[PDB]
Amino acid sequence: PHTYIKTPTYREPVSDYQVLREKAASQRRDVERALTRFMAKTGETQSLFKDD
Amino acid sequence: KIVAYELKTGGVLLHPIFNPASHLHFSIKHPHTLSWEYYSMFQCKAHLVMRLIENRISMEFMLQVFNKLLSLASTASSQKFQSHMWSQMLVSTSGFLKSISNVSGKDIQPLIKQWVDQSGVVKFYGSFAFNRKRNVLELEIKQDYTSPGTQKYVGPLKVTVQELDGSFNHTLQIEENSLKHDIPCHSKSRRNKKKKIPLMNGEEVDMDLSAMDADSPLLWIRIDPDMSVLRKVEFEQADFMWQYQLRYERDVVAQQESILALEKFPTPASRLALTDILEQEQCFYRVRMSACFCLAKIANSMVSTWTGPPAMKSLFTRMFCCKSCPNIVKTNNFMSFQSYFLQKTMPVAMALLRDVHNLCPKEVLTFILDLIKYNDNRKNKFSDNYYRAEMID
Secondary structure: OOOOOOOOOOOOOOOHHHHHHHHHHHHHHHHHHHHHHHHOOOOOOOOOOOOO | OHHHHHHOOOOOOOOOOOOOOOOOOOOOOHHHHHOHHHHHHHHHHHHHHHHHHHHHHHHHHHHHHHHHHHHHHHOOOOOOOOOOOOOHHHOOOHHHHHHHHHHHHOOHHHHHHHHOOOOEEEEEEEEEEEEEHHHHEEEEEOOOOOOOOOOOOOEEEEEEEEEEEEEEEEEOOOOOOEEEEEEEOOOOOOOOOOOEEEEEOOOOOOOOOOOOOOOOEEEEEOOOOOOOOEEEEEEEEOHHHHHHHHHHHOOHHHHHHHHHHHOOOOOHHHHHHHHHHHHHEEEHHHHHHHHHHHHHHHHHHHHOOOOOOOOOHHHHHHHEOOOOOOEEEEEOOOOOOOOHHHHHHHHHHOOOOOOOOOOHHHHHHHHHHHHHHHOOOOOOOOOOOOHHHHHOO
């Protein structure tokens, strides 16, 4: 029945609470790190260390 | 607060007579020469002495005193005579004591003479011994009255003894030459049969009596339980008595003082007592918040004996994390207001853990950083600023 019949398939769904918590956490941390580095680079900046 | 301030520098003198207080570097004749810490401790001591006057003369008579003062003032407040009657709106000490004596028939002049006119707090050092032969409890209460902030107490003193037959109150007369006070003790027939031991309130509980002495019935002793004097108590119980007082007492100040006294006994039974307090809802939440820091101190003192994980970590994952993921914290729902306070105070105490090398372990620091990363607050009706601020702490 490659010759007379057929049926569709789908992509593998990731319904796991652990990896969904990890994905949402890491994406939130990365976007807030990118936002704060962009705003500290395009403005007046301070530094805990000398010339940092 | 007041016993710390009065033992630190001199004492607060309510109602001075015009210097009356020369132990301190400012003059107490005017409010604008007082130190600000003295002003704060003045208001604090004034409301505690009013609680003492309520203890001697009951609360309904106290509210009748206040209503009589307000009623004289409000009959005064409507006249037009220029102060023939407008000075009934001004209270004095003699007028207040006279109104108290009018409504009650008792005068409080010894209590006023001790706690108002005299400027000192008392220090109690207690130690007991149980006489098995005559079945008595020999208390030994001595006062430190030679410190700069202290004074000598000669009144009566309440003591509450929890024995196997229940909770009994005793009044002791502590004169100047007194040292040994023999009070009688009851049976120990609730160790013959397993019966429940009745508490300070009407209830009764099952206690594990394996830690108790075989010859003594008494489970714990509390000197001045109702805080009826301005005092600092230093009682010398045994560590199992402090653990029984932490577990089964129905008074929050006794649970707090047993937490404070269990830091000197780092035995694993005290760790079990504080961990059972921490796991226990229907305990007052500010006792569990103190048991966190007490458990951290005890855990720091019994390194090279601690068996499993660091303290409170497994308990945090049992109470506040997911069942399927132990290292992922649950999403924030702060609607309980007691597990919110306990959740935001438990890593702050957990970070005071130290290893054998005096460095915080990388299992607790990693746990705190995972608490910070996996924090999701898009679902509760409350803000997250104090919890995140405590995470930084």
